[PDB]
Amino acid sequence: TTALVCDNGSGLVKAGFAGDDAPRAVFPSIVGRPRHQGVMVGMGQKDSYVGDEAQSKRGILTLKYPIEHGIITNWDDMEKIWHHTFYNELRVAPEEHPTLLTEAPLNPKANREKMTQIMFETFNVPAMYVAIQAVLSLYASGRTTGIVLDSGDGVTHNVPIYEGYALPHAIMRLDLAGRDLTD
C-alpha cells in the first residue's frame, strides 16, 4: 500500500500520500473553542473547530496552537488535530497506512515517545517512522551534501550534512521563527 507522509510542523499541517509533488491538504493547526454564550438553539454548534474551519469562524473563537516551539505542549489538542487530518482531510483510515512524521532536531525525548505511543495505540497505524526535518529538505533539493537552514514557524535549525554523513556536533538550533516575527 501507500504511505502517509504527514508533517506536523507548527503553524501549518501538511499531509499527503507518498509519491506526489505537493501535499494534498494544507491547513493551519489551530483548535479554537467558542468563548461567548450562544443563544440560537439547534444551530448545531460544536465544541471545538479545528483546522481550516476555525479560520472562518475565528471571530467568536479563541484559537490556540497546540505546538509552541517544535515541542508539543497540549497533547489532547494535537490528538484532535491528527484525527481531523486523517479522517476529514484525507479520508483514509490509519489502520491500513504507514506514517512518516517529522520532528525538529534537539527536541525533548518525551515528545517523540508520546508521539509514537499515540500513533500506535490510538490511531493504530501499521508502522511509523520519525525523521529529522532538515534531512528531508536536503532530499528535496536532490543534493547529498550541503548545510540546510530550515527556518520554520516554530523553530529555526541549521543541520550541516556531508556526503550523507550528518555532523551531530554542528547542529545549531535557534528558537526565533515566524511566530516571534508575527508578535
Binding site: Y139, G142, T144, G164
Partner: protein
Amino acid sequence: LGTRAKESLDLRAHLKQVKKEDIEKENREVGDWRKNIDALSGMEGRKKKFEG
C-alpha cells in the same frame, strides 16, 4: 690503462643497456585521461532521485 678503461666502460654500458631496455620497454603507461568538457547542453532529466 686501456684495458682498465675498456672494462669499466663495458660494465657501465652493460648496466646502462639493462636499464634502458626496460626504460624503453614499458613507457606507454603514461597514457591517461585529460577530462575535457562539452558544456552538456543536452541534459533534460527528471527529478526522481531515490537511489541518492
